[PDB]
Design a protein around this ligand. Structure first.
Ligand SMILES: [Cu+2]
Ligand SMILES: [Zn+2]
Length: 151
């Protein structure tokens, strides 16, 4: 697969559409999310494409190399760690990310896994407490969707 898509839904007002495209040894992530409180919100690939219990059944951040949490620019990060998206005063975040660790094929493939947007900012592992090194202190899961093959 060279293209993928994900539709984010939740039990509140947050919704969004995320697009993925392979380019060289990277994935280009674009799209938008609406219905958010103003400011930064944690954004990650989670391990399982399982929506039987809402966002809870997606499991933890996708982590096939068994590392601690970080930001996307850090060497020590989970494969799924894509940092923060930023919402404007109208509650809209535009997504614009290029990432070298996620993939659409092979061992680090995110096809069939879950994208999640969170309640609070991701502190990129620099919060100075233990939770920072697991989830970035991003808090509850507001919306999610399974990542699918696109035309
Ligand atoms: Cu997450
Ligand atoms: Zn993480």
């Amino acid at each position: 697969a060279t293209k993928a898509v994900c539709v984010l839904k939740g039990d509140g007002p947050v919704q969004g559409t995320i697009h993925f495209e392979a380019k060289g040894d990277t994935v280009v992530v674009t799209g938008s999310i609406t219905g958010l409180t103003e400011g930064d919100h944690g954004f990650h690939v989670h391990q399982f494409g399982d929506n039987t219990q809402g966002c809870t059944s997606a499991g933890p951040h996708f982590n096939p190399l068994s590392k601690k949490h970080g930001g996307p620019k850090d060497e020590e990060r989970h494969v799924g760690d894509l940092g923060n998206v930023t919402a404007d005063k109208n509650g809209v975040a535009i997504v614009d990310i290029v990432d070298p660790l996620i993939s659409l094929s092979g061992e680090y493939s995110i096809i069939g896994r879950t994208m999640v947007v969170h309640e609070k900012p991701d502190d990129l592992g620099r919060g100075g407490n233990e939770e920072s090194t697991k989830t970035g202190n991003a808090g509850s899961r507001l919306a999610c969707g399974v990542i699918g093959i696109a035309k």
